[PDB]
Amino acid sequence: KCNDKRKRGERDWDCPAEKDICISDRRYQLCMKELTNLITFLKLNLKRKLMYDAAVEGDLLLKKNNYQYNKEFCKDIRWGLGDFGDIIMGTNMEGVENNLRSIFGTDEKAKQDRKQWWNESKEHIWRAMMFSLRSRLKEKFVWICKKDVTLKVEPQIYRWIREWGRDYMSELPKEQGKLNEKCASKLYYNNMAICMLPLCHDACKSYDQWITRKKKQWDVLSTKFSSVKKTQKINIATAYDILKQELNGFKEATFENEINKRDNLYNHLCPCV
Numbered sequence: 001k002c003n004d005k006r007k008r009g010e011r012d013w014d015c016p017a018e019k020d021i022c023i024s025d026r027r028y029q030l031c032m033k034e035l036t037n038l039i040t041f042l043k044l045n046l047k048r049k050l051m052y053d054a055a056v057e058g059d060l061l062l063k064k065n066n067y068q069y070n071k072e073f074c075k076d077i078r079w080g081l082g083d084f085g086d087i088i089m090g091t092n093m094e095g096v097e098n099n100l101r102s103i104f105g106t107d108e109k110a111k112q113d114r115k116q117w118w119n120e121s122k123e124h125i126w127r128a129m130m131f132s133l134r135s136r137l138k139e140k141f142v143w144i145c146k147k148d149v150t151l152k153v154e155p156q157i158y159r160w161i162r163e164w165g166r167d168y169m170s171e172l173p174k175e176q177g178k179l180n181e182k183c184a185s186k187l188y189y190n191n192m193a194i195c196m197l198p199l200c201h202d203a204c205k206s207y208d209q210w211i212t213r214k215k216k217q218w219d220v221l222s223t224k225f226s227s228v229k230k231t232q233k234i235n236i237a238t239a240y241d242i243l244k245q246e247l248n249g250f251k252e253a254t255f256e257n258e259i260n261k262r263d264n265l266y267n268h269l270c271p272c273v
């Protein structure tokens with residue numbers, strides 16, 4: 001069953017015990033129903049099932065962002081399609097396996113360019129994901145989801161890093177906001193004392209929790225970026241460069257400085273830690 005998607009932020013990234021990666025709540029909800037249900041007829045049937053799952057995923061993603069056609073939505077479409085890809089192609093880092101065996105007993109157990117099969121049609125799966133929204137907007141529909149960037153095949157590690165980047169850059173002003181709202185004091189307050197006092201202390205340590213799991217996540221995922229190329233190698237090198245390419249304003253310095261709690265704001269508001 002593909003259930004209604006939970007709000008982004010309700011469950012942060014999950015770096016499971018003893019694992020090579022960190023997974024988002026966006027994929028734990030990824031519609032994989034018709035896949036985990038099951039000549040050329042086989043490939044056609046799997047194609048249709050994937051059409052169903054992709055369409056439902058698109059619809060539930062639209063519902064997830066309160067029926068708002070925007071950048072976050074397009075991003076989620078991109079990630080979902082990519083993950084669908086690594087599922088089909090079988091190059092998924094993530095840990096079921098009933099679809100990894102179903103899609104195996106339907107095609108091949110030696111060399112498997114199901115690669116090309118996905119390549120032959122992923123555009124169509126994409127229109128399947130974009131189906132709901134476009135059928136809802138009708139004539140009023142416009143293309144704000146840049147297509148060939150969305151269809152361009154890339155190792156998920158990359159995709160998940162971009163997604164994580166958007167998540168972090170989206171959560172940061174919120175956390176800084178609530179921290180500042182519960183710690184900021186007038187210029188004649190000793191902010192050390194305010195920091196110690198319960199209200200600002202709890203908030204500061206909550207911030208600490210958030211930035212701690214943020215650094216843990218980025219650690220695992222970056223070690224994971226450097227994990228792959230070595231093993232895989234074969235279009236960018238600086239893991240950060242990906243992040244440099246994702247959002248409008250990103251400098252490495254401020255980032256490292258933020259996740260290592262060497263932040264100016266954090267060190268000013270809560271110095272009692």
Ligand SMILES: CCCCCCCCO[C@@H]1O[C@H](CO)[C@@H](O)[C@H](O)[C@H]1O
Binds near residue numbers: 186187188
């Ligand atoms: C010389 C150092 C004295 C510092 C006094 C800072 C003035 C604090 O004063 C307060 O600042 C608030 C805004 O920060 C205002 O909203 C308040 O009306 C004001 O009482």
